[PDB]
Amino acid sequence: FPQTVDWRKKGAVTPVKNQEQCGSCWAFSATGSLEGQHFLNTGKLVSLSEQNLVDCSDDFGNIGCSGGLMDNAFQYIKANGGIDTEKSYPYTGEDGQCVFDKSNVGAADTGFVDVQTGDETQLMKAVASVGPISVAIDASHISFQFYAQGVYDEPACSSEMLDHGVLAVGYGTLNGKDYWLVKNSWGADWGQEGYILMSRNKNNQCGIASNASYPLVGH
Ligand SMILES: *[C@@H]1O[C@H](CO)[C@@H](O[C@@H]2O[C@H](CO)[C@@H](O)[C@H](O)[C@H]2NC(C)=O)[C@H](O)[C@H]1NC(C)=O
Ligand SMILES: *[C@@H](C(=O)O)[C@H](O)C(=O)N[C@@H](CC(C)C)C(=O)NCCCCNC(N)=[NH2+]
């Protein structure tokens, strides 16, 4: 069982994207995890459309640029028969009318799995054995905005009040501190080329294992 995982090195992670000034973190987290599952089951890394989710998934509980949930997105994708490619349905950063096109579908899912709430050992097993995992975190603190390098360690973080969906693409240990390797949606100039190493095995810090999930593909 791996002590260190980095799904970028296996080709399962698209480049870092930028959600701009739209409350669409849930869409970027959902496309990130489904991008991983589609690659790991086909060998093709296909970038998927956050705008498709923002514009079209209101009937599954999402509210576009006003917020949403990754599991709501996975349910919409299942009911819809798929999600368009990023290339065919690119990102505007604003609410739009749904222009989903069946002929431009890049991936599909058949449901989703929620990781046991609060259980970082189960999240570790999912990252290792499934792929990149959608996760919800408390990113409300200025220390998160200003993160540069090393292992983020914010004792003021909440594990109950979560505001930001991101993607767990690996884990490891650095300077004796266990970490989660997390892809953000704030562009590549933020953090470490768009990534952050968050504290692991520090009592579910920032709630990273509180609302973790991934899409199911196939049977
Ligand atoms: C998503 O995470 C939230 C926040 O941790 C979970 O809500 C907590 O669930 C635990 C379950 O043991 C309860 O003890 C807490 O009272 C809940 N907290 C709040 C603030 O409501 C929630 O269950 C998670 N949802 C899913 C689907 O896993
Ligand atoms: C995240 C971001 O853009 O930074 C964005 O604010 C967001 O959507 N946050 C989510 C939680 C994250 C995905 C962890 C959020 O707060 N969603 C609320 C809407 C959930 C759906 N509600 C109803 N009533 N249907």
Residue 32 near residue 130 (C-beta atoms within 8 A): no
Q: Is the same domain home to 26 and 52? A: yes
Distances (CA, A) of 206 to 39, 183, 201: 29, 15, 11
Beta-bridge partner residues of 6: 170
Q: Which CATH number does the domain housing residue 198 bear? A: 3.90.70.10
Q: Is the same domain home to 84 and 126? A: no
Block residue for tokens 């997390």: 182
* Structural domain includes residue 45: yes
Name the domain count of the chain. Answer: 2
Residue where one domain finishes, among candidates 87, 112, 137:
112
Note if 41 is an active site residue: no
Type of residue at 190: W
* Structural domain includes residue 7: no
Counting atoms of ligand 2 from 1, which one is nearest the CA of 67? 8
Dihedral angle sign, alpha carbons of residues 25, 212, 5, 13 = negative
Question: Which of 25, 56, 65, 206 is labelled catalytic?
Answer: 25
Residue 139 near residue 182 (C-beta atoms within 8 A): no
Distance, first Cα to last Cα, the chain: 25
Residue 79 near residue 139 (C-beta atoms within 8 A): no
Q: Is the same domain home to 70 and 149? A: no
Tell how far the Cα of 196 is from the centroid of ligand 2, in angstroms.
20
Counting atoms of ligand 1 from 1, which one is nearest the CA of 115? 28
Note if 184 is an active site residue: yes
Q: Is the same domain home to 92 and 153? A: no
Residue where one domain finishes, among candidates 112, 135, 165:
112
* Structural domain includes residue 2: no
Q: Is the same domain home to 105 and 164? A: no
Q: Is the same domain home to 103 and 147? A: no
Residue where one domain finishes, among candidates 93, 112, 131:
112
CA distance 211 to 159: 10
Counting atoms of ligand 2 from 1, which one is nearest the CA of 29? 13
Q: Is the same domain home to 104 and 146? A: no
Q: Is the same domain home to 105 and 30? A: yes
Domain containing residue 193: 121-212
Largest interatomic CA distance in the chain: 49
Q: Is the same domain home to 139 and 53? A: no
Q: Is the same domain home to 39 and 90? A: yes
Strand-strand pairing, 195-199 and 151-152: parallel
> DSSP letter at 155?
T
* Structural domain includes residue 5: no
Residues sharing a CB contact under 8 Å with residue 155, sequence separation 6 or more, in sequence order: none
Answer yes or no: is the C-beta of 210 below 6 A from any ligand 1 atom.
Answer: yes
Q: Is the same domain home to 107 and 172? A: no
Question: Which of 72, 184, 204, 211 is labelled catalytic?
Answer: 184
Q: Is the same domain home to 94 and 30? A: yes
